[PDB]
Scaffold this active site. Structure first.
Site, PDB file in Angstrom:
ATOM      1  N   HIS A 151       0.787  -1.056   0.159  1.00  0.00           N
ATOM      2  CA  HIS A 151      -0.150   0.010   0.067  1.00  0.00           C
ATOM      3  C   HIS A 151       0.972   1.429  -0.045  1.00  0.00           C
ATOM      4  CE1 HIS A 151      -3.458   2.637   0.064  1.00  0.00           C
ATOM      5  NE2 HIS A 151      -4.334   1.951   0.852  1.00  0.00           N
ATOM      6  N   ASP A 380      -8.589  -7.701 -19.183  1.00  0.00           N
ATOM      7  CA  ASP A 380      -8.469  -8.603 -20.006  1.00  0.00           C
ATOM      8  C   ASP A 380      -7.176  -9.138 -20.692  1.00  0.00           C
ATOM      9  OD1 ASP A 380      -9.320 -10.169 -22.354  1.00  0.00           O
ATOM     10  OD2 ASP A 380     -10.926  -8.897 -22.863  1.00  0.00           O
TER      11      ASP A 380
END
EC number: 2.3.1.64
Length: 431
Positions: A151, A380
């Site tokens: 993070h 994708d």
């Protein structure tokens, strides 16, 4: 049922493109906004139907993406001034290849238990890598992609940009957005310094310095709480009544969960309760931070009331408090924080970030991590978009994670860690 067959470093493949090798002495100083965020690894899981690209195609795509995301092939260290920095030493991201001897459909839908930890590399055993990726091939060809990410390097938005960039590079599509890496160019303090808010007790606190002493503790159970399109519509209608513009799904769902959690915990009516809501500063700051910026750009709205007032007033009143508090986290608030962090007060008063990952003790407060804009349709690799995504198992009571419907049907799923003894009250207060 999950077997790891390979674990190796994947470096930026400059040669794929005849590009000059990156200078492995390159250093990027962490910003005051990076150092305000959690020093911890966050894990997420994506699932794809068969057929999916083979590991070698996914690996080559990762090597190409890391050319434009060298942060994720780097290591944490210090710059010339001694400030925390990303060393762009190209030591590499971890790439873990696994197989599962079951059909993915047989274990679907995956539930938020310790079992899902086996679908991503550990963030809990002190890895040196800042980006850790696991590709798990199930018996009938389905692919699970698990991410474990620091993070301190990126917020949810810039982490998501990398997930998408890996998929774009794999397909041979141009990386979009174009990454922006020069963190030292951003968030310069004003001259003169101008602090307009009190950041002590908000973003900063004074520095404060056993197994099996937690025997009589209630277990924390991660509940999936489904908000139907219909329920959101009623909740938003309720909250927006008499207003010139409707309240957001995010603020309405946050208000509802805050009130539901408070009732479920059965707090004294006089108890102080706050919800921490992440605010994206990219569009709020002037000038605006580009979409491709690879760093953290988050501060928190911390609306606060008493448990009694929250549970006895309608959820509309909670949404109004959240709306007003979120609107105060504006350009001037971000610039006040930046000026305070650059003032010397932090060093002189030995202050540290309130974003403290090393603590599961949130009650009577809650934290909402919104993943409502997590990449899905844009994810994708050339085999189509994922059919399923979920956060990893993080049984921190009152740390709520919001996901969009993996069906694209406009409902919302909240992952709500509750003490087991509070679950039945939560369930009854919910509607």
């Amino acid at each position: 049922k999950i077997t790891v067959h390979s674990s190796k470093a994947v470096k930026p493949e400059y040669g794929a493109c005849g590009l000059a090798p990156g200078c492995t002495a390159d250093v990027v100083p962490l910003t005051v906004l990076d150092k305000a965020n959690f020093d911890t690894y966050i894990s997420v899981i994506y699932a794809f139907h068969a057929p999916a690209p083979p590991n070698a195609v996914l690996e080559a795509g990762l090597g190409r993406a890391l050319v434009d995301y060298r942060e994720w092939a780097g290591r944490l260290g210090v710059d010339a001034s001694g400030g925390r920095a990303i060393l762009l030493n190209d030591a590499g991201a971890r790439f873990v290849e696994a197989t599962a001897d079951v059909a993915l459909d047989s274990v679907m839908p995956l539930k938020p238990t310790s079992e899902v930890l086996s679908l991503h590399p550990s963030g809990d055993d002190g890895p040196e890598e800042l980006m850790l990726i696991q590709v798990t091939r199930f018996a009938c060809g389905s692919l699970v992609v698990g991410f474990t990410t620091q993070h301190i390097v990126s917020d949810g938005r810039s982490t998501g940009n990398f997930f998408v960039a890996w998929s774009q590079a794999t397909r041979g599509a141009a990386i979009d957005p174009v990454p922006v890496h020069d963190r030292a160019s951003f968030f310069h303090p004003r001259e003169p310094l101008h602090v307009e808010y009190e950041h002590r007790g908000v973003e900063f606190k004074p520095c404060e310095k056993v197994c099996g002493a937690d025997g009589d503790e209630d277990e924390v159970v991660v509940n999936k709480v489904h908000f139907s399109r219909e329920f959101i519509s009623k909740l938003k209608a309720h909250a927006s009544a008499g207003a010139p513009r409707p309240c957001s799904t995010l603020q309405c769902v946050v208000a509802h969960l805050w009130r539901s959690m408070t009732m479920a915990r059965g707090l004294d009516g006089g108890e102080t309760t706050s919800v921490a809501i992440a605010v994206d500063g990219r569009a709020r700051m002037s000038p605006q931070v580009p979409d491709g910026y690879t760093g953290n750009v988050i501060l928190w709205a911390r609306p606060t009331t008493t448990a009694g007032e929250l549970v006895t007033r309608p959820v509309k009143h909670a949404v109004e408090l959240i709306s007003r508090e979120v609107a105060r986290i504006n350009d001037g608030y971000f610039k006040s924080f930046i000026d305070f962090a650059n003032s010397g007060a932090v060093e002189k008063e030995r202050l540290v970030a309130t974003a403290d990952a090393a603590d599961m003790v949130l009650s009577p407060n809650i934290e909402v991590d919104s993943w409502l804009r997590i990449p899905f349709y844009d994810m994708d690799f050339g085999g189509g978009r994922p059919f399923f995504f979920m956060p990893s198992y993080l049984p921190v009571e009152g740390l709520l994670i919001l996901l969009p419907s993996f069906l694209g049907d406009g409902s919302v799923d909240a992952y709500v860690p509750l003490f087991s003894r509070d679950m039945n009250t939560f369930k009854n207060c919910c509607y």
